[PDB]
C-alpha cells in the first residue's frame, strides 16, 4: 500500500504539471524533444528531494501524432529493506591474573 501511495502522489503531481506545460494547448510547435527534456528536468527535481533514487535518461522516448504524445520511461524506486538474520555464537576464553 505505501508503494502505491508514493506512486499515486507522484503520478498526480506529474499529471498536474504536464497540464500547465503542454496540455494548456498553446501550440503544436513545441515538439517531442522538449517534452522529453521536461520530463528529465522534473525527474531531476524529484531526485533532488530523494523521492526517486535515479532515472535512466537514455531510456526515455517520445512519439507524437497529431495532437497526442506517447512517452516511455523508467524509474528506480527507493529500495526497501525486508529482512535481517544474525548468527550469534557463544565462546569462552580465560580471564587470568
Amino acid at each position: 500500500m505505501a508503494v502505491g501511495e508514493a506512486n499515486d502522489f507522484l503520478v498526480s503531481e506529474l499529471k498536474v504539471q504536464l497540464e500547465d506545460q503542454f496540455i494548456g494547448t498553446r501550440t503544436i510547435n513545441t515538439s517531442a524533444s522538449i517534452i522529453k527534456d521536461f520530463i528529465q528536468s522534473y525527474l531531476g527535481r524529484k531526485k533532488r528531494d530523494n523521492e526517486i533514487q535515479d532515472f535512466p535518461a537514455e531510456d526515455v522516448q517520445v512519439i507524437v501524432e497529431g495532437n497526442e504524445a506517447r512517452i516511455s520511461m523508467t524509474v528506480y524506486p527507493i529500495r526497501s529493506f525486508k529482512k535481517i538474520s544474525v548468527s550469534l555464537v557463544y565462546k569462552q576464553q580465560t580471564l587470568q591474573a
Binding site: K82, K83, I84, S85, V86, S87, L88
Partner: peptide, 25 residues
C-alpha cells in the same frame, strides 16, 4: 518472506581429495 528479523585481490585456489560436495564443480 514476511519482513522479519531472527537470531584481497589475489584470488586463491585449492583442489584435492575429501568427503562431500558435488563431483566436478
Amino acid at each position: 518472506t514476511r519482513p522479519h528479523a531472527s537470531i584481497s585481490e589475489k584470488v586463491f585456489c585449492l583442489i584435492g581429495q575429501a568427503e562431500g560436495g558435488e563431483p566436478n564443480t
